[PDB]
Amino acid sequence: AQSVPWGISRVQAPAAHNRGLTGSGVKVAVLDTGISTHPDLNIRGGASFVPGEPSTQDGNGHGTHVAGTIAALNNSIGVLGVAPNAELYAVKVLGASGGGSNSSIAQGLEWAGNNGMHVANLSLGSPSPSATLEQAVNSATSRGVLVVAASGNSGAGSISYPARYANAMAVGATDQNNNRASFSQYGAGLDIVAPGVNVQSTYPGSTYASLNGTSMATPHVAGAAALVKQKNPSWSNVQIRNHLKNTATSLGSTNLYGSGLVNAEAATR
């Protein structure tokens, strides 16, 4: 039996699926710890930029979990993605420990741009600015990729990098009451928020797990961007970004919530 995780329902993705929008034909790169083969996922390709981890399989679990929130398959098992027909690419920029380098992350972004990805999901952060990261984000953006990044889980009033760079869309996390999750970083640069508490998704070993974090929120937004691109094939990264903010459900102060809660229904109206 297939279950619909609460956050998928909260961003109203099934309404968009009922309009026939499922992310078909949209290329989405997951820059993370990899993505493992899973009965509820379809991986179309990928690349690794971790020294000594030449495969794209996931030795951590984080990347597989993030991938399922974007595109777990619509079928008789498991869970369901915001964009269950999106084309998933596994771009390994983090090692099994969950950490990587600004150089691997930047290589991943360059790969996404060079390979015509439409959306790049970065459920990761670096605590400090890096000109290398910034130029990579800028480069991918100028080639046409929409970069979506997590605000981070320290609870502080400033957001992590590369989410804090202007050309990266910054996503924070809400809970089931549509309040900001205590850990979700906020402040200058925050664009939008999405469910990030008790998020069930796909996990290595053909299983499912629940996790918390802005890493879990971010793929809700990447998924929604995929639905908007299927409806509006000519739209640029910038148009998609602005339309998501414009159609989000306001939750209050932009400092804490950016435009508010991503709404897949209102954005594909």
What residues line the site for Ca ion (CB under 5 A)? 2, 40, 72-73, 75, 78, 168, 170, 189
Active-site option among 215, 220, 243, 259: 215
Least CB distance to Ca ion at residue 41 (A): 9
Least CB distance to Ca ion at residue 44 (A): 17
Active-site residue, 32 included: yes
Is 175 annotated for ligand binding? no
Is 73 annotated for ligand binding? yes
Active-site option among 62, 65, 220, 243: 62
Tally of CB atoms within 10 A around 106:
23
Is 191 annotated for ligand binding? no
Which residue, 84 or 196, has its beta carbon nearer to Ca ion?
A: 84
Which residue, 138 or 232, has its beta carbon nearer to Ca ion?
A: 138
Least CB distance to Ca ion at residue 224 (A): 17
Question: What are the Cα distances from residue 206, in Å, to 29, 41, 47, 74, 203?
Answer: 21, 10, 22, 16, 6
Single out the residue of 204, 163, 168 nearest to residue 184, CA to CA. Answer: 163
Which residue, 63 or 78, has its beta carbon nearer to Ca ion?
A: 78
Is 256 annotated for ligand binding? no
Least CB distance to Ca ion at residue 123 (A): 15
Which residue, 50 or 227, has its beta carbon nearer to Ca ion?
A: 227
CA dihedral of residues 200, 8, 150, 135 (deg, nearest 10): 120
Active-site residue, 175 included: no
Single out the residue of 113, 1, 98, 131 nearest to residue 47, CA to CA. Answer: 113
Active-site residue, 17 included: no
Is 168 annotated for ligand binding? yes
* Residue with the shortest CB distance to Ca ion: 78
List residues with catalytic annotation: 32, 62, 215
Known binding-site positions for Ca(2+): 2, 40, 73, 75, 77, 79, 163, 165, 168
